[PDB]
Amino acid sequence: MLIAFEGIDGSGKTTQAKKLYEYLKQKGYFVSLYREPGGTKVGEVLREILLTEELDERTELLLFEASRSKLIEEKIIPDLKRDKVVILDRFVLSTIAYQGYGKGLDVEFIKNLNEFATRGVKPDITLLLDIPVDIALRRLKEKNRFENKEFLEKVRKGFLELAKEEENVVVIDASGEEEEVFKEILRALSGVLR
Amino acid sequence: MLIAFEGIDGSGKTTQAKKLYEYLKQKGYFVSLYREPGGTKVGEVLREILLTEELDERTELLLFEASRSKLIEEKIIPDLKRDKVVILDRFVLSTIAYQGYGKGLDVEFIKNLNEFATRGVKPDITLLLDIPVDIALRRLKEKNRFENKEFLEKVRKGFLELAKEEENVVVIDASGEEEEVFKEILRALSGV
Ligand SMILES: Cc1cn([C@H]2C[C@H](O)[C@@H](COP(=O)(O)O)O2)c(=O)[nH]c1=O
Ligand SMILES: Cc1cn([C@H]2C[C@H](O)[C@@H](COP(=O)(O)O)O2)c(=O)[nH]c1=O
């Protein structure tokens, strides 16, 4: 069971993924939670480079993918073979939305790199935490973080287009309150998982 | 002018590249010399990961390309626009030969990654320093370095196959002595 949380910065997806992780643990599932980029020693090194250094968009794409490849090989593939529920804070749709829709790189090229890095592993379900950019920015403002409105509008749109096209993507209204959002999440998971 | 040195570990390509850099500098060219992976601040961080850590082959592929992308964008493309002679100690054929012929990753997929990382920048000439694996291992043994014979035989073959197929790749007999190898390098360079 692979569960992917996706969406823009300020959508609450980190918080919600952690919330799901603790909920599923309590219900007796064996659960893993990983962030992208990161989630492995090598991954976190790359994550630090990605968040620190001034990188061109091609180099960035290759590093996000390298981080995913490490995660898939070292953690996710073994976890899944052990019937762990794997929860991801970002996955392959983040790359298409950010590097494709946002930075203008080729979407079919991105999808081939995603395939390559994941060895074709796909989520059972992707939760897209959709939120207006203005509301996301407000929320980040409270935690003292600032992101680019023009860029995030493209990204948001990208995500919503992917949720129509791609398989197994449910759109969550992440503008609501924390418990309300979480119960929408539990509803979209029902069926797929008890 | 972009000049790429390629070949297996122990072929002398590092030494020859530095020898060509100093030679062309003396003749009044404006020259750069970079190694792959590496050659930029970010690239050297990736290089250390690649040389230190236990990596699967797909992650390795992606990091070699990330390093290339950084190098291309930050240094090579600006160096070329300024008519510098850019000398590379390894480039795209090393990726195909090591990750493709050696580790078994798809060669066409590698060629597409190479294209993407380079923005299509291609050498004017590639010097393949071909050498028997046994001789290369003997030379590495003297500097106290040990590499995998089975793996390097596949890589050497891959290189040779690429020198037949790919454009502007000249095979140099890197088994000779230093000055003799450098003479063949200057000969091949006198074609471009
Ligand atoms: C996984 C991934 C993240 N990112 C970005 C989104 C965020 O701005 C940052 C990850 O941080 P966040 O989840 O901590 O907001 O990296 C990409 O641009 N592409 C990717 O493939
Ligand atoms: C540039 C490059 C090098 N390599 C290998 C060749 C060497 O073993 C090492 C580069 O370091 P060296 O040439 O300084 O020993 O990494 C690849 O496997 N793929 C690549 O794309």
UniProtKB/Swiss-Prot annotation, chain B:
**Transmembrane segments annotated in the record for this chain:** none
Q: Does the keyword DNA damage apply?
A: no
- Catalysed reaction per UniProt? dTMP + ATP = dTDP + ADP
Q: Does the keyword Secreted apply?
A: no
Q: Which domain of life is it from?
A: Bacteria
Spell out the molecular function terms from Gene Ontology.
Answer: ATP binding; dTMP kinase activity
Matches recorded under PROSITE patterns: THYMIDYLATE_KINASE
The cross-references to SUPFAM superfamilies, in alphabetical order and at most eight, read: P-loop containing nucleoside triphosphate hydrolases (SSF52540)
Q: Which GO terms describe its cellular component?
A: cytoplasm; cytosol
Which biological process, per GO, is one annotated for this protein?
Answer: dTTP biosynthetic process
User: What is the uppermost EC class here?
Assistant: transferase
E.C. number, please? 2.7.4.9
**What are the entry keywords?**
ATP-binding, Kinase, Nucleotide biosynthesis, Nucleotide-binding, Transferase
Summarize where ATP binds, as residue positions: 7-14
Query: What does the protein in this record do?
Result: Phosphorylation of dTMP to form dTDP in both de novo and salvage pathways of dTTP synthesis.
State the similarity comment. Belongs to the thymidylate kinase family.
Output the HAMAP family linked to this UniProt entry.
Thymidylate_kinase
Q: What name does UniProt use for this protein?
A: Thymidylate kinase
Query: Which species expresses this protein natively?
Result: Aquifex aeolicus (strain VF5)
Q: What is the lineage of its organism?
A: Bacteria, Pseudomonadati, Aquificota, Aquificia, Aquificales
